[PDB]
Paper text:
GS from [name] is inactive in its resting state and switched on by 2-oxoglutarate, a sensor of cellular nitrogen deficiency. The structure of MtGS in its resting state was solved by using the diffraction data obtained by Engilberge et al.. The data was collected on a crystal obtained by co-crystallization with a crystallophore ([name]) that corrected the twinning issue inherent to this crystalline form. The MtGS structure presents the typical homo-dodecameric architecture as seen in other structural homologs, with a monomeric unit divided into N-ter (1-111) and C-ter (112-448) domains. Moreover, terbium atoms are located in the active site, coordinated by the residues involved in the Mg2+/Mn2+ recognition. In the apo structure, water molecules replace 2OG in a pocket with a similar volume and slightly open to the solvent. In the resting state, the ATP would clash with the Phe206 and would not bind without displacing the β-sheet 10 (residues 199-205) and the following loop (206-209). In the resting state, the loop 318-325 is constrained by a network of hydrogen bonds and salt bridges from the Asp50ʹ-loop, the side chain of the Arg321 itself being sequestered by Glu70ʹ. In the resting state of MtGS without 2OG or the glutamine feedback-inhibited BsGS, the Glu-flap and the catalytic arginine are locked in an unproductive conformation by the Asp50ʹ-loop.
Residue numbers in the entry:
A (entry chain A), B (entry chain B), C (entry chain A): 2 to 38, 39A, 40 to 448
């Protein structure tokens, strides 16, 4: 959308209120709103903000600590302008996703959106490279427990691909897809997942920045649609013990000079050296990547040993027990699926680190290990050690320490985000590790 | 419908969401849904999926364990395309029943729908044979027990063919019939059944595959209509002790070269040798057939001795105490009624095994025993032994063991479904056998 | 008490029931009881059991797995014979603490009591050494929350050394002291502790085996006295966040050839080389010792940074921020206080490992570091590193891994207890680490 197209939309729909939206380091969306003043002057005052941005106090935004927090700037990305996706019939209100800039007019180093844009621009400028991601976020719908109102339980008792009445959210999944599709946030399959009250909405395999914006919009929209139905939607990775957690498998590829670089008709499995170097890079840096793609203490309750748990650092052409699975599609569709991520991650940061790790593999021409097709949960600890299969960190603190020692990720995220993320997350881990949990009370009050 | 007819429907109705439906081994319907993209590009993408199919992960579908579960395919049967039968006024959504295929473009051996199609196609190719089934599924409508909200009781106190007000579901039966008829899922008689809250909807005597699709559609639709009325519909075979269970008598016949092969104007009872060989085949294999037509532990609480219980392996022209009853209709309508099946069966598998057993009788020219008109329950054990009247298995495990030793059924179902069904059902039996039931607590807590 | 003294007590008090008590690897007391038969024959049958022991099935005792579990033996220690300490007016019942033996008549390697006896006997035989321990166990008294009956809260709102009515347990502390003192389980100071509902009962500085028996008796007795008052006593180390946890400081010393070996009138601080070598041994092995002295996941919620937390591996003559504090008493009373232990430990195992670590220091003539008087919580991370001050493990798993790599402790505990303890505790850690905690639900359900 061009400035002129936005101004004409504003005039035709009599837009009276505009939201400027951005994201904090933890991936929480944020927005400040302003009235649209009447008259060509108001249209001129809006053009000025749309082209040059608006000032805001970022001192209370998580991860935005720095000099001049009280006069930071929001620079609108007009490609994202639209009616609110979660209130699409209220044409008098609109929003635009923005990048964060400093008072000086330069991208703010602590901006997660600007971070992904930076690494993608560098890849485009240096290698004429494009980066595509197709994520598969899962989530649970919850209702208040009838026996205890203070607690939430899964909204239904349905299962994988189930139909109503066991599946109690076919209209909700349909409605979120309509809300996103209607405004260009392209999505693919939707269905009830394995666990009671669990669901999935797949996203189009697309430009990583568009994908990240689609994911942040989807998270707000599904939560508002759930509330209209008296339910709560959660992206907590493992809300209930004894049932599946929620993951966000990320299909991804890189194209160099307009060609699907991962494809080589004549190579083993039809996977190019570039695809293998990229896979090698993801595997090499996997222990550090998960600090960002699985950034909660609860993320590690899903990343626990099991038949399909994506905790084993290996790749496969069919094995779901590996952290990377390569779909059978070839040609333009050749891509790799990172299965470790969960939907609690900040998509802008998760996509940045996967690209940086894969590109480090390409840059250093890293050799990939042999694929592992044998189910890895079922093999012994000795068989794993013999095959050199390492696991991802067992908890958030272990992942943070791996990230702290990873210079490739530090360069990708930049010092501000890397240090702010480590500081906030070490404090989060400290809060959890000093707490007295219900597990402990149940296990030890009798001693 | 043809590919063009489906595309015209999508364009006219501006269909924005499409469900691809299939069935698992236990007969539970499954579906994944996708948005219909805008304009010509979207019509072309939809044409491709309609003609060539779409990939899905079958790893979480019961009975679908094979190489590359993550990339299996759904191939739409356009003869089944329509608005959702249970949401007929929402024209922006549609569904299509699909066959399950492998990544190689071949029917998946574990697909129950493809299974019935395979046996029917083989019969058509080798003998120019057609197979027709007219099932009579019964079901209960339930309401919460006002004394105990956690329990369900029959929805009314009405009886066989009763009128309102004792019959509290005349509008529900009328509405399910209209929902199915309106979309070509042909149905016939509907009425309140013998037990409180029990009902029946009879299906057109038709091509067995169309019949199975109609039954699978009816089960979802009646459950959604019941919920709209604050009730629950159940196909549990024997939900309440002391009252009738729910059966699914299956009328069936085979026609060879366009002729009603079961009819012979000059033979005894006007029943042809082909009819008698088919009847002999069903009777010979009955103990194994019930493992599929009666696949639940609870199915054997309906298959218990009684005046009208279809547990006696015999046939008759009027006796309701026999497992096979031959209706009086002759000519084109000549057919046999297998009375053992209950609505918990997977119709695709039940129809497959009845045809295979009957065709084994035709192939081997098996002699049928004499019909038994005398009430079998009323006669002594010695009279039954003298007449050679055996009984169907007494419980699910006994039926599974009979199926395991039946090569005719193994060939009909194919190794994948045969072994998967036996494994799943033996685990279901174990769960029941090791449980501590309410009956045991009531009988033994005092000892 | 001699066999004859026990038999005469049995005859005079008409004892009709006798309990044989022992302890499992986790420090949980266990007992089997038998009737005393009438007549000299019954007195003779009792003499036989008192001298030669009785058989029992130890297959269901935690840490007793091995060959012939169903015919293990309990060998009574007549020095421990008495009326039940928690039912002292019921003279017709008595108990005796027993050591665990194998069917062959040799001490069972998995017995915690026999373990402490073994290390103490070896020390006596080789060096004419005696080992004394004076523990200070703290505990909380709990009442049901009025708002939520399913939860427990501190029994009162009193504080350190408080008097009634703020202190609501002066009669309970008095009554436990009377119960123990009356039967020779010597105790010293008793008082309300810092936290609401928290209390302390100090034990006489005595022979380590007598002390361990006194501690196990005290734990059962305070729990029964609490129940008589409608309360619950717990030794959980950190039952409530935001208030002090419960510790069990252990004063200890060794005497060689009847002399207080830790005392040297002419040495710095009047502490002998033997005392310094012992202190050096405790400090060297501290990371592994805490796996046994702090054997619960919750133990590490008390072992967290704080002004007085005993987490810093250092010793001091006055600093409470160090893991070892040396009381000012000299001469016969010269001793060292290990502050890390909590009352969840198995006293027999805790006393065994502290002695073995200290004796390893004496054996190798280990040099002790300089004492640290400066408050260690208040100093920087750099000041600590410069002074070489290490901390104890941050969680149970970290402590288990330290214990697994400690051969001194493995020799002290013996292979059976060392491996059984590691196995049980790694499974306990696994249960905690895969659980979904209330902390996680509170922190992430909103994401
Ligand atoms: Tb730029
Ligand atoms: Tb359920
Ligand atoms: Tb999924
Ligand atoms: Tb494309
Ligand atoms: Tb490594
Ligand atoms: Tb800071
Ligand atoms: Tb064919
Ligand atoms: Tb009635
Ligand atoms: Tb009927
Ligand atoms: Tb017809
Ligand atoms: Tb004819
Ligand atoms: Tb037989
Ligand atoms: Tb299997
Ligand atoms: Tb000895
Ligand atoms: Tb208070
Ligand atoms: Tb104290
Ligand atoms: Tb003394
Ligand atoms: Tb060290
Ligand atoms: Tb073991």
């Amino acid at each position: 959308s061009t400035v002129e197209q936005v101004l004409e939309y504003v005039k035709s729909n009599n837009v009276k209120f505009m939201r400027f939206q951005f994201v904090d380091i933890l991936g929480v969306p944020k927005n400040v709103a302003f009235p649209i003043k009447a008259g060509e002057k108001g249209i001129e005052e809006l053009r000025d903000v749309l082209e040059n941005g608006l000032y805001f106090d970022g001192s209370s935004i998580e991860g935005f600590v720095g000099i001049n927090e009280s006069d930071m700037m929001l620079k609108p990305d007009l490609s994202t302008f639209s009616v609110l996706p979660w209130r699409p019939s209220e044409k008098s209100v609109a929003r635009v996703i923005c990048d964060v800039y400093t008072t000086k007019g330069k991208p703010f180093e602590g901006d997660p959106r600007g971070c992904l844009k930076r690494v993608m621009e560098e890849f485009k400028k240096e290698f004429n490279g494009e980066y595509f991601v197709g994520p598969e976020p899962e989530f649970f719908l919850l209702k208040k427990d009838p026996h205890n109102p203070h607690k939430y339980i899964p909204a239904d008792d349905g299962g994988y691909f189930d139909l109503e009445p066991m599946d109690e959210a076919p209209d909700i999944r349909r409605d979120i897809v309509f809300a996103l599709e209607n405004l260009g946030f392209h999505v693919e399959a939707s269905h009830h997942e394995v666990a009671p009250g669990q669901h999935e909405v797949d996203f189009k395999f697309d430009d990583a920045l568009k994908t990240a914006d689609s994911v942040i919009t989807f998270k707000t929209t599904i939560k508002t649609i759930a509330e209209q139905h008296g339910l709560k939607a959660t992206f907590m990775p493992k809300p209930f013990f004894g049932m599946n957690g929620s993951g966000m498998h990320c299909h991804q590829s890189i194209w160099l000079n307009g060609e699907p670089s991962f494809y080589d008709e004549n190579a083993p499995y039809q996977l190019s050296e570039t695809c293998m170097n990229y896979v090698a890079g993801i595997l090499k840096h996997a222990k550090a990547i998960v600090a960002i793609t699985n950034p909660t203490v609860n993320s590690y309750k899903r990343l626990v040993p099991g038949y399909e748990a994506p905790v084993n650092i290996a790749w496969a052409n069919s094995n779901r027990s590996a952290i990377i699975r390569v779909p059978a599609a070839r040609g333009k569709g050749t891509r790799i699926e990172f299965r470790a991520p969960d939907p609690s991650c900040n998509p802008y940061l998760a996509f940045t680190v996967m690209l940086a790790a894969g590109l480090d593999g390409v840059k250093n021409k890293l050799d990939a290990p042999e694929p592992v097709e044998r189910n890895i949960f079922a093999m012994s600890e000795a068989e794993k050690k013999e095959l050199g299969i390492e696991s991802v960190p067992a908890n958030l603190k272990a992942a943070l320490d791996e990230l702290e020692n990873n210079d490739v990720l530090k360069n990708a995220l930049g010092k501000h985000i890397f240090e702010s993320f480590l500081e906030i997350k070490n404090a989060e881990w400290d809060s959890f590790r000093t707490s007295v949990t219900d597990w402990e009370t149940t296990a030890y009050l009798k001693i």
